[PDB]
């Protein structure tokens, strides 16, 4: 049963640049080392009864990072979709990418579509990777779905309430986010899951994403259990 | 100039029940003592160049608190609109109430409307009191404004983007929220300004709202200045 009653954990995976800079290295080196922490967090979540794990992997504002940092990132995503997918599948993990995927390269989009298809029937941990994601953008997509319904004459503007918009934001089919963890030291949620984090516990740690391990994750969970 | 470059501070005024319970008293006693901290925070903000101060005074979920706690609260609001309004006016503070005011009693609504009218032309601190407010509700009101436009044939569903919804959420005429402070010990934003806090620094303190003073406020500001 969910470690300390926590059903859905979302993580802002920050501090990779800081971690690499402390060792005289570039951001891209830290992002690669960040992929190992992703593996450890996914394994920990799947082994501790967590229902969904949602990871902030690429904000819609990160397009403005250096071109080479961005390309290295895209190649890291492709690489992960090639290397870990069989394993997610064997572990009964259902993979979903949330965010505006229409802006990624062809090969990246085809791989996302196939990996999600392959694991769509899995019933264990749902792993959501937020890529080219923004919380405001997420809300706007639901708003457009409803505006279209207003267009078609199938919905009256006065019928729109919170629950109806809630059924049109990302991850509405999953348990609500209970805990948001941000590594790296900064205390902002940076446009991550705005609608969905309305009642979530927020946990900030100076631990840098590439160093985040099982004891750190257990620690964030215990802060949650003592969410008294 | 804004204390340490902070233009807009929003506060979740919590810990009043805990503060009163520690002394063997009921929540209502803590909420009354909370009114003194409101005075101190408003004075501090107006004297330190802050452009807007937004205070969470009554969540839309607080209707479920004990009837007598709720009534005492309504009477505390009326009382404040009667006692502090002249002073806000003399201090060049512009008062705004955000939230669903249609659900308050007649006398409370008339007083809100007159106090806002009286200070509408003031040019110093804008003080927003979030009463019967919810962040999701706030977003839905903007969504209805746009859905109506879609109805009237004056807007196409594909023209709706973040900036357009941003012009229809509360406080869109003010500087964006830079710092959210929550007193009381809990680490949740509890449906407060979801859309607006996308890039805000979040500061949690175990200090209880009735004890929050100028040194505590200066402290939250310095954490912000070191928002590095
Ligand atoms: C999903 C997968 C297979 C791997 C995940 C790889 C990682 C860790 C991705 C996050 C990349 C970015 C752009 C993080 C932003 S903060 P930053 O760390 O770039 O810089 P900061 O140190 O916080 O200032
Ligand atoms: C605007 C004005 C004139 C005065 C403000 C008066 C105050 C402090 C209002 C907030 C009241 C409520 C319902 C706070 C909720 S948490 P809680 O403190 O009720 O309980 P908690 O201790 O956090 O568990």
Swiss-Prot record, chains A, B:
Transmembrane segments: none annotated. Changing residue 209 to F: Decrease in affinity for IPP. Changing residue 65 to A: Decrease in activity. It catalyses: 8 isopentenyl diphosphate + (2E,6E)-farnesyl diphosphate = di-trans,octa-cis-undecaprenyl diphosphate + 8 diphosphate. Changing residue 93 to A: Formation predominantly of C(60), C(65) and C(70) polymers rather than the C(55) polymer. It comes from the Bacteria. The record marks 57 as: Required for continued chain elongation. Keywords: Cell cycle, Cell division, Cell shape, Cell wall biogenesis/degradation, Magnesium, Metal-binding, Peptidoglycan synthesis, Transferase. GO terms for cellular component: cytoplasm; cytosol. The active site is at residues 14, 62. Isopentenyl diphosphate binds at residue 201. The record marks 125 as: Important for determining product length. Mg(2+) binds at residues 14, 187, 201. The keyword Cell wall biogenesis/degradation applies. The keyword Coiled coil does not apply. Its cofactor is Mg(2+). Binds 2 magnesium ions per subunit. Homodimer. Belongs to the UPP synthase family. This is Ditrans,polycis-undecaprenyl-diphosphate synthase ((2E,6E)-farnesyl-diphosphate specific). The lineage of its organism: Bacteria, Pseudomonadati, Pseudomonadota, Gammaproteobacteria, Enterobacterales. The gene is ispU.
């Amino acid at each position: 049963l969910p470690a300390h009653g926590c059903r859905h954990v979302a993580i802002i995976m920050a501090g990779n640049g800081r971690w690499a800079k402390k060792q005289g290295k570039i951001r891209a080196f830290g992002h690669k080392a960040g992929a190992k922490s992703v593996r450890r967090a996914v394994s920990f979540a799947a082994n501790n009864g967590i229902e969904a794990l949602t990871l902030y992997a690429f904000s819609s504002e990160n397009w403005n990072r250096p071109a080479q940092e961005v390309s290295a990132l895209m190649e890291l995503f492709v690489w992960a979709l090639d290397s870990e997918v069989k394993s997610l599948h064997r572990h009964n993990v259902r993979l979903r990418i949330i965010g505006d995927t229409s802006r990624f390269n062809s090969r990246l989009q085809e791989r996302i579509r196939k990996s999600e298809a392959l694991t769509a029937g899995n019933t264990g941990l749902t792993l959501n990777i937020a890529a080219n994601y923004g919380g405001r953008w997420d809300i706007v997509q639901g708003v457009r779905q409803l505006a279209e319904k207003v267009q078609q004459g199938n919905l009256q503007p006065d019928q729109i309430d919170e629950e109806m918009l809630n059924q049109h934001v990302c991850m509405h089919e999953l348990a609500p986010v209970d805990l948001v963890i941000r590594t790296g030291g900064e205390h902002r949620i940076s446009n991550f899951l705005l609608w969905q984090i309305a009642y979530a516990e927020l946990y900030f740690t100076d631990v840098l994403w590439p160093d985040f391990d099982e004891q750190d994750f257990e620690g964030a969970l215990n802060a949650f259990a003592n969410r008294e």
